[PDB]
């Protein structure tokens, strides 16, 4: 129903080498379609999805010169930030940038994003109103005053509400067979006795799309999350995703526990019980 | 598609 377009930017300064590392990736939902690496031989924007390949030379040469400017911007940003926090040039630092847009089940604009991070911590972020900036510290205020004077937020809105959305709609149409599909999870339960009095029940969810899924364990009809092990959703490597949840269960009381799977391509939420 | 404007920090 609802879809998204994302661009992730990573710039890491390398004191040991001559040039800082820059990596830029583009995502439509949970599928990667473009990449750019500063240490790559080609020095061009690279297709990663099958459906993005149908774009002409006009697109690729334009996206190449754009990401190169993005790379150049973040190289300067590394030097600007080290001066803000008064840090030495001997230490490595990471600048993370993310921007993109969300559409609803009607393919209309819902949310827009534009945010930065320095060494893991938040720096500057565009608010939900698309007119405001959130500065984390006093060094972020200097950036905030630069962008408010240049009216960058107003320039950004034209991209997020327009260009980001209309190109996302173009991608969804071109990759109809891949992006508009919905895969239902294959579910099964596995059992392992950890001790003479306890046992682990694992609730598997395999081969599903998109990655967004909910796995909850219940004891006697009540949500148990205090004694639940949940792993990060992992890609299979073909377009589908995988995830599981585990609980510590006293021996003989395995049937008192239930797993609940919620997915978009699933007509009804499934209840799973050990037998 | 990428954003055509490139603001610095």
């Amino acid at each position: 129903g609802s879809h998204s377009m994302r661009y992730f930017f990573t710039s890491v300064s390398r004191p040991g080498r001559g040039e800082p590392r820059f990596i830029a990736v583009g995502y439509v939902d949970d599928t990667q379609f473009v990449r750019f690496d500063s240490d790559a031989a080609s020095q061009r924007m690279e297709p990663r999805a099958p459906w993005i390949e149908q774009e002409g030379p006009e697109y690729w040469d334009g996206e190449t010169r754009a990401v190169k400017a993005h790379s150049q911007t973040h190289r300067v940003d590394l030097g600007t930030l080290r001066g803000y926090y008064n840090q030495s040039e001997a230490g490595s630092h990471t600048v993370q940038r993310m921007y993109g847009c969300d559409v609803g089940s009607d393919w209309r604009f819902l949310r827009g994003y534009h945010q930065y991070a320095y060494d893991g911590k938040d720096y500057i972020a565009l608010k939900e109103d698309l007119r405001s900036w959130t500065a984390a510290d006093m060094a972020a205020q200097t950036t905030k005053h630069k962008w408010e004077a240049a009216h960058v937020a107003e320039q950004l809105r034209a991209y997020l509400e327009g260009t980001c959305v209309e190109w996302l709609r173009r991608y969804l149409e071109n990759g109809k067979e891949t992006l508009q599909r919905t895969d239902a999870p294959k579910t099964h339960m596995t059992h392992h006795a950890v001790s003479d009095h306890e046992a682990t029940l694992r609730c598997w969810a395999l081969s599903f799309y998109p990655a967004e899924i909910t796995l909850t364990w219940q004891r006697d009809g009540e949500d148990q999350t205090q004694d639940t092990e949940l792993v990060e959703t992992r890609p299979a490597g073909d377009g589908t995703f995988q995830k599981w949840a585990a609980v510590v269960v006293p021996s003989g009381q395995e049937q008192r526990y239930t797993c609940h799977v919620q997915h978009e391509g699933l007509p009804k939420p499934l209840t799973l019980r050990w037998e | 598609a990428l954003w055509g404007f490139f603001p610095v920090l």
Epitope: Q72, A150, Q155 | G4, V8
Partner: T-cell receptor, first 113, second 114 residues
């Protein structure tokens, strides 16, 4: 104050001769532009640069080639001069705020058979 | 698409009278417009911006209000003076290209007479 300079200020060339237009800028700007003006009307982009050693094509690149050896200098080169290249050439400069461009004094160029 | 249309040719005005120079534009998304002034034997320089607030921006004096509904950004002044004799460019800063750049119009020559 942001000041941009051009050389030469005036140039007379023959058809099929090499012409080089220089532009110096000492404002610490990454973005530099080459425009042309025809009979006191219209300002069209020929080539531009956002960083040193890299040049991008503008609106009308045909018959023109450009070079950015350093941040300060951005050259416009004409390998084969034609009659249609008779114009007044302006050199612009800006930072990331690319809508506020600072222009040079201009260069009158006339190509004759 | 992505175009600027100005008042064609020479505009002759007597000193004291209000200045009016037209600028219409074609654009794909929410854009921003700028006026560039060029005096005789001088470099073209930025005159005024479209910011600030709902349509209204402007410096020297000179002012312009942006109307997004009909895509208009006309240059205005209360009382013209002899020093206003110059060429005026209306520019559209590309709202969304692969690379954002200024698109200049054909330019309107103002000739204020005494």
């Amino acid at each position: 104050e942001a000041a941009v300079t051009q050389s030469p200020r005036s140039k007379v060339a023959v058809t099929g001769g090499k012409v080089t237009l220089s532009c110096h800028q000492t404002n610490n700007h990454d973005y530099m532009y080459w425009y042309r003006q025809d009979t006191g009307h219209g300002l069209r982009l020929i080539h531009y640069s956002y960083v040193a050693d890299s040049t991008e094509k503008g609106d009308i690149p045909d018959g023109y080639k450009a070079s950015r050896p350093s941040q300060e200098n951005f050259s416009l080169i004409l390998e084969l001069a034609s009659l249609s290249q008779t114009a007044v050439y302006f050199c612009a400069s800006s930072d990331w705020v690319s809508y506020e461009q600072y222009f040079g004094p201009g260069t009158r160029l006339t190509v004759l058979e | 698409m992505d175009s600027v249309t100005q008042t064609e040719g020479l505009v002759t005005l007597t000193e004291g009278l209000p200045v009016m120079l037209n600028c219409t534009y074609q654009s794909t998304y929410s854009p921003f417009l700028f006026w560039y002034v060029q005096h005789l034997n001088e470099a073209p320089k930025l005159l005024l911006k479209s910011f600030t607030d709902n349509k209204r921006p402007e410096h020297q004096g000179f002012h312009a209000t942006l109307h997004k509904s009909s895509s208009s950004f006309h240059l205005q002044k209360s009382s013209a003076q002899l020093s206003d004799s110059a060429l005026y460019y209306c520019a559209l800063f590309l709202a969304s290209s692969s690379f954002s750049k200024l698109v200049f119009g054909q330019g309107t020559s103002l000739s204020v007479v005494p």
